[PDB]
C-alpha cells in the first residue's frame, strides 16, 4: 500500500450530483463489487466479478479507481492501493452516501 503514487494528479473533482455507492456496473448491471473511476466518475465492476473497470482502464488509461465496498483506491499502473490527502474528499463524500457519517 502506497502513501503516494505519481498518478494522483489524474484524480478529478467529485461531480456536483455526488457519488452513489449503490450504483450498478455501467456494462453488466451487477451490484456486487463496483468501483468508481476518479477521473470520469463512471461506475464499473471489479476484476473478481466481470472486470468492466479493468476494461475501462484499458480503454481510457484512467489510473485511479475507488471501491464502493471498502472505500479504498487502487492505481492500475502502480498495481497497488494508494492512500493520500488527495483521496480524502472522494472517500468522505462516498462514506457519507454509504453511511451518513464522514
Amino acid at each position: 500500500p502506497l502513501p503516494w503514487c505519481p498518478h494522483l494528479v489524474a484524480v478529478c473533482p467529485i461531480p456536483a450530483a455526488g457519488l452513489d455507492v449503490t450504483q450498478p456496473c455501467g456494462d453488466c448491471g451487477t451490484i456486487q463489487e463496483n468501483w468508481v473511476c476518479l477521473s470520469c466518475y463512471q461506475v464499473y465492476c471489479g476484476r473478481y466479478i466481470n472486470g468492466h473497470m479493468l476494461q475501462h482502464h484499458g480503454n481510457s488509461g484512467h489510473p485511479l479507481v475507488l471501491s464502493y465496498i471498502d472505500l479504498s483506491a487502487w492505481c492500475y499502473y502502480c498495481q497497488a492501493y494508494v492512500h493520500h490527502q488527495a483521496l480524502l474528499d472522494v472517500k468522505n463524500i462516498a462514506h457519507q452516501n454509504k453511511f451518513g457519517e464522514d
Binding site: 468501483w35 471489479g46 476484476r47 473478481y48 473497470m53 479493468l54 482502464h57 479507481v65 471501491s67 471498502d70 479504498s72 483506491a73 487502487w74 492500475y76 498495481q79 492501493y81
Partner: peptide, 14 residues
Amino acid sequence: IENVKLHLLRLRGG
C-alpha cells in the same frame, strides 16, 4: 503473529 492484528482475502484492487 500478525493474524491477530496484513489486512483481511482483499487481493488486487480494481
